[PDB]
Amino acid sequence: EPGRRGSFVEMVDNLRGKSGQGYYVEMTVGSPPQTLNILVDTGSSNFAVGAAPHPFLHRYYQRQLSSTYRDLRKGVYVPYTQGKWEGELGTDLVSIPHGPNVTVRANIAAITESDKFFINGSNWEGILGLAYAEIARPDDSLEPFFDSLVKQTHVPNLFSLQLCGAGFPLNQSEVLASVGGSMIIGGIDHSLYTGSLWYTPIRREWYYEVIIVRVEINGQDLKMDCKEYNYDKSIVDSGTTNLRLPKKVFEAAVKSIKAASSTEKFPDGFWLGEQLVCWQAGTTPWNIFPVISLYLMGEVTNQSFRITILPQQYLRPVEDVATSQDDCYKFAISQSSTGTVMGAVIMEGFYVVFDRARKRIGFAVSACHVHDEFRTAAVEGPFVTLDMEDCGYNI
């Protein structure tokens, strides 16, 4: 054996937040530096910050107060089914206090209008899209922040994320004082995980796309054509709360999870991820819920590995509408019409390494994943898997 050292102490524990409202890191923009909390999102590629008064913002980017602000004289509109924002493009000097000790000039979308984008009480005033230029708006000519960081400094083309769910509800005061995880920029900190790191290839450089080759519910093979698991794509997205699955896969998964937890009957609203379920304090029956394993393509031909999450990950802690002492949760798995989305729910069980340089994503059991005395999340391999390329979807 050999104890693994943590070499990026300055960046360890630099995140705050939770799966339902997002995890954020502190950043500064402009001269003099204007401090803002920014949502870490591996599912988008724009660096955008509130730049005008808004009911849910306690502060925002004031371009007129920055001597280094540069106007790009271009607007941008970014709509999502669950949120939309409009902004004005420009550039300025940006830094990450608890990150690399560098300052770079990057693109910034000054949000002037928005709808259902900012979340009341989330404590963040902007978003940091860490994905590739291909999906940046208005187009791929707007260089993403991380690309600027790597091109302008000696920071390695890699970052890693340890999102830490608490395992219980956090009130407004508590979530502000709690450590929500770590975003290590330019490296891998070995104190954040246990076991070994297993890597899956980044299929294409736009979203952080990966390929799932097998799915199990408590060891039972869902037995669907693996192509279904990646229809029309599978991505790792810290900006989405739930583990989202293609309609057909969701239907098969929920049926299997229902069967595995059949000793307890839950209302349809629960399985729809709409209503919470509660149990008397400390009595949550974790053991009746199954573990979920997702097998991912490995880097070696015909080789795969699996990541296994517990209900402690897919059941999201929520406060009872009566703030009672009951322990309540919402089912954090839902259907998608845009492919599989490995959201915050899933990432909370692992330390995820976005190895841009080697076009691969690594997974390892997180040192802060919630579990019980009987089961733990896992990352195991290798397994012999054939024709994994056929699992990928093509329009």
Ligand X SMILES: CCCCOc1ccc(CSC(=N)N)cc1Cl
- Quickly count: other Cβ atoms within 10 Å of residue 130's Cβ: 24
Burial class from Cβ neighbours inside 10 Å (0-12, 13-18, 19+) for residue 316 reads buried
Burial class from Cβ neighbours inside 10 Å (0-12, 13-18, 19+) for residue 296 reads buried
Asked if 355 is an active-site residue, the reply is no
The nearer residue to a copy of itself, 72 or 224, going by C-beta atoms, is 224
Contact letters (x/-) for a copy of itself, 217-236, by CB under 8 A? -------x------------
The nearer residue to ligand X, 30 or 239, going by C-beta atoms, is 239
Site for a copy of itself in 240-269 (CB under 8 A): 248, 251-252
- Residue 185's closest CA among 148, 137, 133? 148
Residue of 189, 237, 327, 355 marked catalytic: 237
Q: Candidates 6, 33, 83, 382: give the one binding ligand X (CB under 6 A).
A: 83
22 binds ligand X (CB under 6 A): yes
Beta bridge partners of 277: 329
Q: What is the closest distance, in whole angstroms, from the C-beta atom of residue 39 to ligand X in the complex?
A: 6
241 binds, among a copy of itself, ligand X, none (CB under 5 to 8 A by kind): ligand X
The nearer residue to a copy of itself, 86 or 216, going by C-beta atoms, is 86
Residue of 41, 92, 189, 355 marked catalytic: 41
Q: Which two tokens stand for residue 176?
A: 């502000």
How far apart are alpha carbons 79 and 111 in whole angstroms? 12
Asked if 147 is an active-site residue, the reply is no
Q: Which two tokens stand for residue 12?
A: 């360890």
Q: Is the dihedral of CA 249, 300, 205, 243 positive or negative?
A: positive
Q: Candidates 18, 20, 86, 185: give the one binding a copy of itself (CB under 8 A).
A: 86
DSSP secondary structure string for all residues of 135-182? G-SS-TTS--HHHHHHHHSS--S-EEEEE---SS---HHHHHHS--EE
Number of residues that bind a copy of itself (CB under 8 A): 7
Catalog residues that contact a copy of itself under the rule CB under 8 A: 86, 113, 115, 224, 248, 251-252
- Report the interface residues with ligand X, using CB under 6 A: 21-22, 41, 43-44, 80, 82-83, 117, 119, 237, 239-241
Could you give the residue numbers annotated as active site? 41, 237
